[PDB]
Amino acid sequence: RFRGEHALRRYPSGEERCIACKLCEAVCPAQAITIEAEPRADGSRRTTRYDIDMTKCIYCGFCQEACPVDAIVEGPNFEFSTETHEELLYNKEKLLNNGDKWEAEIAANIQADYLYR
């Protein structure tokens, strides 16, 4: 269990695991995470705006803890270096969804997380 760069996880059979609650929004002590939600096509209601600032965020794992569906899981990350603030602050999911390269490690790390240690 180590906290680095944020990445949101998904279910084994497709589907975005984040349900849009604004739960992690209010717990966030830096107010780095922003969420505005709209209905997805028909029936399902899962996110639209999802920005996490790296200009902010003091790294707590609070958003990992407050999440009932376990969407934001903190992966073992170190590599992050940019030329601008714009390149540094995370956009509407997308780059957070691009955490698939770290989601293989996250799935292994969460197996040591259920029933804590």
């Binding site: 604004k22 739960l23 209010a26 717990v27 407050a66 009932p68 259920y114 029933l115």
Partner: protein
């Protein structure tokens, strides 16, 4: 020794006190604190009762992750201990626990 915080006086403590108020004797006591600190850590390893990690009352601390997913009241309290705070009793309180630098007099 005077004011216990969380299970004190039960653990054996040694406090170094010098004689002269110079920088050298004020340095010696800090090293004497360090040699007489492992005694506490060893006694912490000796005395460990297995049980609860958080407060069982779910108006202060959020419940377990396996617990919240099944039962109802757990997740509603999880929803309200996050976002909304604690709902604290009103009153002014002062606490000071020994810092190695001095004190953290939170008011």
């Amino acid at each position: 020794k005077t004011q216990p915080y969380d299970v004190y006086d039960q653990v054996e403590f040694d406090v170094p006190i010098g004689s002269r108020g110079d920088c050298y004797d004020r340095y010696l006591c800090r090293v004497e604190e360090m040699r007489q600190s492992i005694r506490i850590i060893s006694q912490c390893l000796n005395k460990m009762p297995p049980g609860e990690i958080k407060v069982d009352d779910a108006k202060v601390s959020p419940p377990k992750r396996a617990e919240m997913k099944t039962s109802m009241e757990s997740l509603i309290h999880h929803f309200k201990l996050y976002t909304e705070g604690y709902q604290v009793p009103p009153g002014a309180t002062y606490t000071a626990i020994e810092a190695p630098k001095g004190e953290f007099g939170v008011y």
